[model samples]
Target: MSGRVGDLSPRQKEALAKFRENVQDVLPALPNPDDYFLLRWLRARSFDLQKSEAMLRKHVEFRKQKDIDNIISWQPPEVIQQYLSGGMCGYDLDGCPVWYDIIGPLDAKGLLFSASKQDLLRTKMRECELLLQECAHQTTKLGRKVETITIIYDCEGLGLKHLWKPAVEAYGEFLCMFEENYPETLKRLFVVKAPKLFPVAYNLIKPFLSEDTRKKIMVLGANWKEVLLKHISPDQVPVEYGGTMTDPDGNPKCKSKINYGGDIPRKYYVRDQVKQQYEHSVQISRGSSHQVEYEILFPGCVLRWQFMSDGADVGFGIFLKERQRAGEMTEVLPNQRYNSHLVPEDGTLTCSDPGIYVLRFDNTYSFIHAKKVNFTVEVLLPDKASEEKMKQL
Candidate 1:
């Protein structure tokens, strides 16, 4: 059972063989038809060739549909320059790649609006390559296959806005891509300074993950600094995450030392004219419906909204103007979306057709309760050309 494909076990080799045999028809069509990529699917589905092949087929289809082949050496846009969010700080004690993301203080929406989604996707996929390619050197140092990585998400000011609609969808797409395309590379994902709203996003984020991948995550809040110490050492972690490491010159541990200078400045923040900004305070009674309607006159325009419940979790949904179908089920957006969220919510709903859009809040959970909500809705022009440029690429 020991001697098998290169570094893999006999069982691993057998599973890899069966998987190739199953996906033979679909395998050749993929961009990088390598065993290592297929191996990810095999291990993700626990060697179930059928299930693994299903996911691989989807990857191939996506590559074909999105023309993902040309993205191999794709460079991120200039906007990405302002976002020095996080990078390879150092390695963990167990020798896993220690990558950090400064999630807070930065305007994720600004960054999203600044560039095309295709570039973002390509940038992310390229990042996945680097994350794994470096493992060979680490494996040599450790004398074992190091297939995992540790991510430290600095959650300062990390709020629901970071999980904005298109960003959430984009991120979800990346997560699905990561889970299937680059399976099982996660060692641990620790969220430092995870706000009260972190779980709100995590709940939605976890379902897309494989059961095993989900298990590798650790979403820590106020006490994250202490919890991170277990998986990481003080010397490896940045001082911001309660570590003792200084910068390259050991210069008293500043923000720039950690590669997190600050959020994107206002000048770099791309702001399309806000067609309208509506602010409102509404009281929602228990077991009832309270909603705000906005008229989307332009089919190509974007409906960007930011809202929050004064307190408590609320079920929220966006629906096209339709009647007689109330309360039976939730409406889904273009990406086949879902309602039901925690507050301080922000999302972008692109109008496929001109019509009235309903922003609803459901408070049916409590029998005799009421809550106040403060929200702002902004109308934006869809930056279609930003994504359109990817077609030429």
Candidate 2:
């Protein structure tokens, strides 16, 4: 039966042959309800093996597009632009211009922040007091300014699952503290996320928001629906701003826009198969020698990853490297675990040195199982910078 199944297009035959080979090689390794069943279903229908493979490829491509569409349909386009633009307005006490790029939306409330490569050392020194205080609380006597911070909720190790509900609540608590303890900082108090998750975070926090704070917060991220659904309600999430557009004079005008049903609360497109698979793979591969790397902008920092079997291990390699190279890494903290638990199952690591450095990950093991391991890298700057400075080189 397998031999006769060879009558297919060259591409289809090649795919089919590879599929068969993979099936045989992975049969023992397959956990169960395996790829074999999916293959069997395709073969039984007298489907062109190549066509079937193409169809499968298309299915995946369609699914990705669908996920993106679902995200687009739910949020305001302007909000999306703000997320992608990653611009901010603010400054430090010295009045030094602090410009930054919008890396992407983070899981938590604030956008990731970085300093200019040239200014990282000076900025780290200037802000060393605050940076060191934060790092000191998180680790031992690491005599250096902090650089990068990554946040993930569903990760296997040091992930946010256990901390999600608490973190959100804590953010609320922090808001309360800001209003009470430091009323001056209250004006600056803002909640931000990647544009995609902004709507979700906003919605989740909306019920608890006061009118003034609501307006003060800004949401950022690629897609808001996924982040919102995962954190908050699935029923009718409201769009803060819809598909309304503006002209050069900044007046509302008619223009081709993505349909984000105005005033009509959007519902999440619930598809658990892909998301579950992706999250599960992420959980399993949390700390397995696989890493996601990033070059952070403010307090210039480099982030590296090594997914251990138990939990995700992160290493914050700071300072300028003499030459561009891999494995030529430095530890932020010399003695303590360079790898802190990111998820309760994984640990998080941050850099103490303040400078620009290349970041990379080791994910050789992750791709073996045919799963998606997404790595989101972002560059952030302080809020008080002019627009001209943040532009990417």
Candidate 3:
């Protein structure tokens, strides 16, 4: 038996005892309410009595409201099957479950419009439950709690179009459900072949993420396959991501992989597609910062960007010249796009105040071979950038 059930620290023990007392009415009648399953919720909220209790209550209400106790009854609404296809690539080295998501080919807006939000939420909850069940079974075999999961998101054709605000919020709702109820379950979230627009979608959901969870995310570009191969086995990976991996048996009943080259093939999505993308090159002299400033005279507009270093990757950041930070000589944007992606990076920022804005490509720290870098910048009013989205996978 896993010792985790009894190996609670004094704080977790107290938190566990208090959590059960507060959440009793909402939970099922049981001799011990602070079971491993419930503890997961408590851990996710970091033992915050109020937050965990509310998460549990709302989660219970959501389950009853959506009849989520039964997920086998829920079927992938044909459209979701074609796009947003998710599968369990074999377990990682530790026997923890590994999942792969083909996000590039999916339409976030279409799924929301097709299925009722409640039904979609039910589908997600069911999957989480099944994953937990697998994790628990593996833990029993290993004599330890195997709670983490590895997720690989193939964003070959991902772009701004996939990040519609309405759909972003809606898609994010399920993610919220996952975080609140199944806390601390993430192991590694490797986003492979991520487009320049990924950060825009990323920031929308960044506010809710805990620090530990944020640290687990890895966003890589065209050569992401190389990075992933370091952590995952080729036999456990799929053929698409340069893996020769296959099923245990010749019959091979592994979770099927979805290669979304042309995300959401036209048949599954009836909506007409539009593409909006901008590109230009910026040469950075060695040891000097190449700064591009966008003079935004208005407020509430979104600053979106996608760019790549023809020479591997480079450092990028945003500086605001707002009066609040005017006390300082220069203010670096909070959502630092400073991390260098192997090939590219993308993100969005909503202007707080209309003033001088700066997008600095820091070659101040890179080699001399950083010139002729290709990049694209889009300043849209809420939904304009969605028009011009996507590039090669």
Question: Which candidate leads the pack in TM-score?
Answer: 1
Score candidate 3 by lDDT.
0.65
Candidate 1: the clashing residue pairs are none
Please provide, for model 3 over 107-158, each residue's C-alpha lDDT reduced to its tens digit, 9 standing for 90 to 100: 6655654555666667667778777677878988999778779988777676
lDDT of 1 at 123: 76
Best by lDDT: 1
**What CA RMSD would candidate 2 show?**
25.6
Residue by residue across 266-366, what tens digits does model 2's lDDT show?
A: 22212211111112224323333333334444442223222222343433322233444444565343322233233222222343455554433333333
Candidate 2 — which residues are off by over 4 angstroms? 1-211, 214-291, 300-326, 329-393
What global local distance difference test value does model 2 have?
A: 0.31
lDDT of 1 by residue, 228-256 (tens): 78778888776766788777666544445
Total clashes in model 3, counting residue pairs 3 or more apart in sequence or in different chains:
7
lDDT of each: 0.66, 0.31, 0.65
Runs off by more than 4 Å, candidate 3: 1-7, 25-35, 109-114, 140-143, 221-223, 247-393
